[PDB]
C-alpha cells in the first residue's frame, strides 16, 4: 500500500496496517507536496490499475496497492491564455491554482502526455499528423527547457510513447533528421526565445498545459460508458437500451453531457442545477431542480462512487462549498464541518464581511492543522482540538467551543467573550468557488 506523486523529488507515502480514508491520505499527500488547503479539494486518489477514483469517504485497510495522487478537478482555460475560450477565476471580496498546484499539475501533465493518459488527438490529414508530431517535439523542448531553467543550468523521454514507437519504425536517416530538428528547436528556444519573449518557468508550464488542452483528447474531462441510459423531464423521455453504446462526459466548464458512442454532446446539466444524486449498486440517478433527471447503469458500485464523487466535487467547486449531493460519497470533512458550522479555507475578508452583515470559524488558508476563529489560532492535533498557546485539548471542536464560550478572552488592552457563530449559508459566494 503506497501513495505515489508525479513530483520526482517526492518519495511515495507508504502506509502500515490500519484504516484510512482517501480524504486524510489526500491531506497528507497535500502536506507532502506543499499543496495549500485552498487547492486540496482539487486532488484525489487514482488507482491506475482498476482505472477508478476513490471517493473522499472511501476506507482503505491494509497486501500491496499503488494509489496515485492526482489533480482530478479541472477547468479548461484556467490559465486564461486562450483568448477564444471561456475565462475561469476564483471569486474575490484571482487565479484558480497556486504555484504548488501548478507545479504538480505540470508534472502530472508531463506524466499524462508521456504515458499516454492524455492521448494525442487524431490527425485530420497526414500534414496535420506531422504537425502534431512537431508540436510534441515542441512539448519536449518545453519540458527540458523548464527542467534546465529550474536547476539553473534526448527528446524520447518527453514525448508520448506511441509517437516514440512510431518514430522507431522509420529509417535511420529520418531518425537522425528528427534528432537534428529537435536539437535545433531546443537550441533556438533556449538561446533566443527565453530571452526575447522573457519566458519564465510559469509561462512555460502554462503554455505546456494550455497546449495539452488542445493537443490531446478530452483533457481534464472524465468519460463514462454505459449501455443503459435514461434522460427524463416534463417535456421528454429518452431511454437508451441496446459492448457499451453510450457515453456520459463530465467536465468542470460544461458539466454533465451525454451522447451515442461513435454525434455532438448533449447538455444534461451544469452542477448548480443538480439537487441530489442517488446510487443503487451500479445505477446512478442525478436529479435537477426542474425535476429533469438522468439515470445510468455503470459497470460497478465503485465506478458509481467514482462518478458521483466527481460530480459532487465539481458541485462543491462551482455551486456550494459546504454541501454534498450524495451520502455515499459524502466527504468526512464536509460533513463534520457542516455539523460544526465551520467554513473551508475562505479569505479573512469574507469572514469579516460576514461578521459585518450579521464570530466565524474557518479552516486556515496556510496549513491543515489549524482552524482560524474570527484572528485567533485553533490547533487540531491528531483528532484533538485546542486553543493555540494553551495546554488543554478536547476530543472534538464542539467540546473546545463549549469550554471556550465560558472564558473571558483578553487581547492587548481589550477583553471580551465569544457570542455567536455565523455558520455558512447555502450557495454563498467565496474564493472557494470557481466562476465560469
Amino acid at each position: 500500500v503506497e501513495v505515489i506523486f508525479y513530483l520526482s523529488d517526492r518519495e511515495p507515502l507508504r502506509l502500515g496496517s490500519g484504516e484510512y480514508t482517501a480524504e486524510e491520505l489526500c491531506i497528507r499527500a497535500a502536506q507532502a507536496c506543499r499543496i495549500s488547503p485552498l487547492c486540496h479539494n482539487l486532488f484525489a486518489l487514482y488507482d491506475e490499475n482498476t482505472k477508478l477514483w476513490y471517493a473522499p469517504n472511501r476506507t482503505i485497510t491494509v497486501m500491496s496497492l499503488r494509489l496515485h495522487y492526482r489533480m482530478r478537478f479541472y477547468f479548461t482555460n484556467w490559465h486564461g491564455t486562450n483568448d477564444n475560450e471561456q475565462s475561469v477565476w476564483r471569486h474575490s471580496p484571482t487565479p484558480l491554482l497556486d504555484a504548488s498546484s501548478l507545479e504538480y499539475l505540470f508534472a502530472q501533465g508531463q506524466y499524462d502526455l508521456v504515458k499516454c493518459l492524455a492521448p494525442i488527438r487524431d490527425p485530420k490529414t497526414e500534414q496535420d499528423g506531422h504537425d502534431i508530431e512537431n508540436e510534441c517535439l515542441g512539448m519536449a523542448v518545453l519540458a527540458i527547457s523548464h527542467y534546465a531553467m529550474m536547476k539553473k543550468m534526448s527528446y524520447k523521454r518527453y514525448i508520448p510513447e506511441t509517437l516514440n514507437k512510431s518514430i522507431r519504425q522509420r529509417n535511420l536517416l529520418t531518425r537522425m533528421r528528427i534528432n537534428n530538428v529537435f536539437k535545433d528547436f531546443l537550441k533556438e528556444f533556449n538561446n533566443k526565445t527565453i530571452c526575447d519573449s522573457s519566458v519564465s518557468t510559469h509561462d512555460l508550464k502554462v503554455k505546456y498545459l494550455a497546449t495539452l488542452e488542445t493537443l490531446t483528447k478530452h483533457y481534464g474531462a472524465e468519460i463514462f460508458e454505459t449501455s443503459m441510459l435514461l434522460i427524463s423531464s416534463e417535456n421528454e423521455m429518452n431511454w437508451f437500451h441496446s459492448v457499451l453504446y453510450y457515453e456520459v462526459m463530465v467536465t468542470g466548464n460544461l458539466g454533465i453531457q451525454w451522447r451515442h458512442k461513435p454525434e455532438e454532446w448533449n447538455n444534461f446539466s451544469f452542477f448548480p442545477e443538480i439537487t441530489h444524486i442517488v446510487i443503487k449498486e451500479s445505477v446512478v440517478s442525478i436529479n435537477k431542480q426542474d425535476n429533469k433527471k438522468m439515470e445510468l447503469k455503470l459497470s460497478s458500485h465503485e465506478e458509481a462512487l467514482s462518478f458521483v464523487s466527481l460530480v459532487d466535487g465539481y458541485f462543491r467547486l462551482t455551486a456550494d462549498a459546504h454541501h454534498y449531493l450524495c451520502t455515499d460519497v459524502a466527504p468526512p470533512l464536509i460533513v463534520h464541518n457542516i455539523q460544526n458550522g465551520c467554513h473551508g479555507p475562505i479569505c479573512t475578508e469574507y469572514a469579516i464581511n460576514k461578521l459585518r452583515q450579521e464570530y466565524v470559524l474557518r479552516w486556515s488558508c496556510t496549513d491543515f492543522d489549524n482552524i482560524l476563529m474570527t484572528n485567533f489560532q485553533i490547533e487540531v492535533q491528531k483528532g484533538r482540538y485546542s486553543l493555540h498557546g494553551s495546554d488543554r485539548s478536547f476530543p472534538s471542536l464542539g467540546d473546545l467551543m463549549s469550554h471556550l464560550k465560558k472564558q473571558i478572552l483578553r487581547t492587548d488592552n481589550i477583553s471580551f467573550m465569544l457570542k455567536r457563530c455565523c455558520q455558512p449559508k447555502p450557495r454563498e459566494i467565496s474564493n472557494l468557488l470557481v466562476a465560469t
Binding site: 506531422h130 508540436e135 515542441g138 523542448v141 536517416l173 519566458v199
Partner: peptide, 29 residues
C-alpha cells in the same frame, strides 16, 4: 527513398514554442 517523408519538410517552429509579445516600437532620431 530515405527522404521521401514529411520529416524532410523545411523546419517550422512549433507554435507551442511561440511566446508572443507586444513588441511596440518607436523611432527616435
Amino acid at each position: 527513398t530515405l527522404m521521401g517523408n514529411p520529416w524532410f519538410q523545411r523546419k517550422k517552429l512549433p507554435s507551442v514554442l511561440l511566446f508572443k509579445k507586444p513588441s511596440p516600437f518607436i523611432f527616435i532620431s
